[PDB]
Amino acid sequence: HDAGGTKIFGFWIYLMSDCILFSILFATYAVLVNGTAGGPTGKDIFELPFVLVETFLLLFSSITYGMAAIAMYKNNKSQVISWLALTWLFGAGFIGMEIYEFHHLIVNGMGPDRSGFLSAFFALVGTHGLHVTSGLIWMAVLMVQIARRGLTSTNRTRIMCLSLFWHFLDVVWICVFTVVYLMGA
Amino acid sequence: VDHKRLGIMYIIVAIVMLLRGFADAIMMRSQQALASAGEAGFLPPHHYDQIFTAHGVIMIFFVAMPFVIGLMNLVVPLQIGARDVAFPFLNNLSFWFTVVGVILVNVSLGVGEFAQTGWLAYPPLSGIEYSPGVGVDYWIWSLQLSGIGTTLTGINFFVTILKMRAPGMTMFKMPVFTWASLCANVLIIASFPILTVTVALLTLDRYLGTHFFTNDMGGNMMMYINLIWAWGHPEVYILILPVFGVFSEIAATFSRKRLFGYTSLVWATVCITVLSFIVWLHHFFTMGAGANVNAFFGITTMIIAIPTGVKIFNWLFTMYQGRIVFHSAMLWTIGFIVTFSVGGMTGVLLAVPGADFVLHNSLFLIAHFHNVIIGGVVFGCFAGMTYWWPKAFGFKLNETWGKRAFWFWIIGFFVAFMPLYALGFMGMTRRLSQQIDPQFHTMLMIAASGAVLIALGILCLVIQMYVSIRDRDQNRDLTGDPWGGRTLEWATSSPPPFYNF
Amino acid sequence: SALLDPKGQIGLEQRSLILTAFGLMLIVVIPAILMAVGFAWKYRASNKDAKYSPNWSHSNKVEAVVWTVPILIIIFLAVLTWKTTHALEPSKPLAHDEKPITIEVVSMDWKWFFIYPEQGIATVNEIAFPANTPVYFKVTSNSVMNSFFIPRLGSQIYAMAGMQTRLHLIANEPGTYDGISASYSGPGFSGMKFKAIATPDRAAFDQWVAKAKQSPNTMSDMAAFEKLAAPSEYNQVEYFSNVKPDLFADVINKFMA
Ligand code: HEO
Ligand code: HEM
Ligand SMILES: [Cu+2]
């Protein structure tokens, strides 16, 4: 009766691994930038970084309107799954545009990549495009887990944990655009 | 799968491996004694570069690294008053991963195409190694696997300490070897990741043709250098902070007196942990640093002495009132308080920008650190190894040869590295394979001579221990040492009942 | 057979090499006392010298004991840092009198090529220059980075590919010298040594260029340039009687675009 929420602070510290990664990385980009846009430069129109954002933004509250109707508020079994589902959908979507764009950024470029501003950037997201792969797969896996096992009030450790991992992710994404895209350009 | 036994689990790896590293070094260090090609029989640098460089590549990440990840692994628990460690299955893999990197290292060596870019492996030298270049590749891989591992330990253990000590114990009653264990441990957290990123950046360079560091398309070297060196300095802190702990207890016990300046030392450990993420440029000075950015990174590191004095002086006062014993353990403790503070100045000296301009990457450099490492860190490992050898094996240490291996170990260090300092003033270029100036050719002989002794000693101890396990005076007491050694672990049986305690 | 800083034949070296000794003599105030307290202990505080092991906790002026003094060191041996931290440093610092030559380093594979902007010749593994005069150093790299360093002159600095390194120097005595490489190790990183021929006066210096002027070889182009930079360890002290008007820039450019 104490070891219950141990993996929590024991994961909350775990973010200090994927929290600094996203900081030194930014530092690289933040460097690989002032090199002055010399000729070849790929621009981005303010539409995808609004549909990408929105999507990934609804999740910030696809768990805010959920956590409660997940256990906190008097649990209701299923009433904690169909929502995860929706949530997984937006994850698979957010990752979609994250792929449509790239393709488009290699359909014109017949292979050979150039410059770092289509390098660092070209990777900055990648990570943010992987973190939201496993952190999007572990979610759905535990989904099928919450089925047979089925968690309940107080007893929900992981889904309130993950609701901190991901809740952090979007935070990192409430910059990406609000620094790279808009500002950069 | 039990923290305690995993603890040993480490040490083993280390020992079995120093039988390799040493051998490796013990051998190449010869070439600088005689002139010409020598009995070596080596064609151009190919191998020299590899070897002498692979060395330091190892000793830092695979044989001396285990120390902290090993010790805290076998003694932090039993003394705070617990039953094992927070994340079971994980504490296991924290090692098993550091293991992978092992066999993974001799994978680049099992083909003779092992890198030679500096234990760190700088740019223009790394990526340019032809398309067939799988050499550094293995190097960039072994440290990744191994990377993640030690990354957990600092997490795992961090939790154990912040949620599983002894009931009633306030964070203030925390033992020395524990306070320090925290500090250095948190470090592996807020610092070790840095490398991972960096290591990846390269990954793409040599594997995907990206230009994270190619200035011919957009990349820059002045970036890669910052990261490795930003997180590098810390590496030198997590590998000695813990020793403070081990050192404190080995001292206090036998001298029969509590560790003076408690609070004082307390924050020291704290302080020392802060002023570390902002002083890395002292590895940059030559690579063009802003005369003003010189200070922000040169001056910072210069204050870091004050924190070092605390510890030392504080242990002294722990001696001032007498009744100290000088057995195996307390003997190393000696060396520390000596050698360590020896090379210390060297760091206080190089601290100033210009003071190093002539010595940087010169033998002096090699002499500055091996000091604080060999006689400052490698002493710890051994020093502690004694104090706790029973608490984990069921038997005490042969005080005979223990006093023997010691001397050969203190003596030789100097006959093998104090000479290097000279070579530095006359300005000797590091990792060279071919030199000529008769002068250097001389000190080198002394140096390459200081080892013949150190070498043989690594044998005496290692042979003594064997003699200590098989043959033993089976101790059946609970505490072979005086009442001075007072930490919850001791009260326990040696060894502990298999299910801990 | 030496145990002290390089031969005092340079102005800078003084306020750069003296630094070390000066401070080392003002640091000892600690190590000596540290190599004092640690020693004296196993002495009188021993078993046969102290019936037992009494016990106490603090006083807080025990820290003071060794408190204000360390920081006193890290102040004296601190103020110096700041001030002293200049001279050799880059940036721009102007100081001319229409005499200070301006060499340009082109450390290629295991050799040290040079470019004389207003002379017309070229070198490999040896750069001469007058005495008591400014030596303007323009440096960079064609292959991997390296270090430009003259021991007896305490003059070191990097040489990163695609960039200009700034450093100047003053020799205050004739004689030749030698220059070593950078921390990097590999086939030949231990053979890249050059001299620093410092003749009596510039009269004999005007001739150093002369002799080269005769050299039956010139560095007129980049095609020829990559030729002298081709794989070859330990290059003999070679020369060139001609150097394309802008070879320096010729390098950076290619390795910047
Ligand atoms: C873990 C080992 C270790 C330790 C403990 C230290 C400790 C220190 N180091 Fe050393 N270092 C270590 C390992 C290395 N250092 C390096 C490089 C390095 C460099 C750059 C040199 C170069 O790469 O060319 C500098 C300037 C220092 C400074 C210091 C300082 C000031 C300390 C301080 O911690 C010293 C603390 C001790 C003191 C201060 C003396 C004791 C006396 C006291 C405290 C009384 C107070 C004294 C005064 C007030 C004067 N280190 C490199 C080279 C990396 C490479 O290969 O490139 C390594 C491996
Ligand atoms: C007394 C036993 C040891 C001996 C005799 C020894 C000897 C050497 C020698 C001769 C070099 C090459 C210097 C040069 O030519 O530039 C070297 C380099 C190095 N040593 Fe040791 N060493 C010893 C212990 C250690 C230990 C315990 C460590 C700590 C981890 C260590 C870390 C290094 C490192 C990092 C380098 C540089 C590697 C590189 O070139 O990339 N050494 N050592
Ligand atoms: Cu450092």
Residue at token pair 């808009």: A182
Who contacts B367 (Cβ-Cβ below 8 Å, separation ≥6)?
A: B343, B346, B417, B418, B420, B421, B424
What lies within 8 Å, CB to CB, of B92 at 6+ separation is: B1, B6
User: Residue B354: its chain C contacts at CB < 8 A?
Assistant: 16, 19, 84-85, 87-88
Task: Tell me whether C136 touches chain B (CB under 8 Å).
Answer: no
- Which positions of B are catalytic? 10, 20, 24, 28, 52, 73, 84, 91, 94, 98, 150, 153, 160, 233, 235, 237, 248, 264, 308, 311, 368-370
Burial class (CB in 10 A: 0-12, 13-18, 19+), C83: exposed
If interface means Cβ-Cβ distance under 8 Å, which residues of chain A face chain B?
2, 6-7, 9-10, 13-14, 16-17, 20-21, 24-25, 28, 31-32, 35, 113-117, 119-120, 122-123
Q: Are C171 and C129 in contact (CB under 8 A)?
A: yes
Chain B residue closest to A27 (CA)? B223
In chain B, residues with a C-beta closer than 8 Å to the C-beta of A114 are: 217-218
Nearest by Cα to C52 from B328, B317, B315, B255: B255
Please tell me the number of Cα atoms within 13 Å of B119 on its side-chain side: 16
Q: Residues followed by a break in chain B, C–N over 2.5 Å?
A: none
* Best probe residue, ligand 1, of B369, B373, B378 (max atoms within 8 Å of C-beta): B369
For residue C184, give the amino acid letter.
Y
- Give the C-alpha separation, B388 to B246, whole Å: 9
Query: Which residue is associated with the tokens 């809740």?
Result: A167
The helix/strand/coil state of C194 is strand
Residue nearest to atom 31 of ligand 1 (CA): B347
Strand ranges inside chain C, DSSP E: 102-108, 111-115, 122-124, 136-139, 146-150, 155-159, 165-167, 178-179, 194-195, 238-240
* CATH number for position A34: 1.20.120.80
Ligand 2 binding residues, C-beta < 6 A = B 25, 29, 52-53, 55-56, 59-60, 64, 118-119, 366, 370, 373-374, 378, 416, 430-431, 451, 454
Tell whether domain B1-501 is in CATH 3.30.70.20. Answer: no
What's the domain count of chain A?
Answer: 1
Please answer yes or no on whether A115 and B218 come within 8 Å at the CB atom: yes
Distance CA A159, CA A77 (A): 13
Domains of chain C: 1-87 (1.10.287.90), 95-257 (2.60.40.420)
Instruction: Give me the domain span that covers residue A114.
Output: 1-185
Q: HSE on the CB side for B61, CA within 13 Å?
A: 31
Q: Relative to the CA of B307, which ligand 1 atom is closest?
A: 44
Give A149's contacts (C-beta < 8 A, 6+ positions apart).
none
Residue B19 is given by DSSP the state H
Q: Is B200 in the pocket of ligand 1 (CB under 6 A)?
A: no
Task: Measure Cα distances from C65 to B261, C60, C68, C77 in Å.
Answer: 12, 9, 8, 19
Instruction: Please name the helix (run of DSSP H) or strand (run of DSSP E) that holds residue B412, with its range, or none.
Output: helix B399-425
Instruction: Collect all residues with Cβ–Cβ distance below 8 Å to B314 and sequence separation of at least 6.
Output: B259, B260, B261, B264, B265, B268
Query: Would you say B333 and C41 are in contact if contact means Cβ atoms under 8 Å apart?
Result: no
Resolution (angstroms) stands at: 3.5
Please give the DSSP secondary-structure letter assigned to residue C180: B
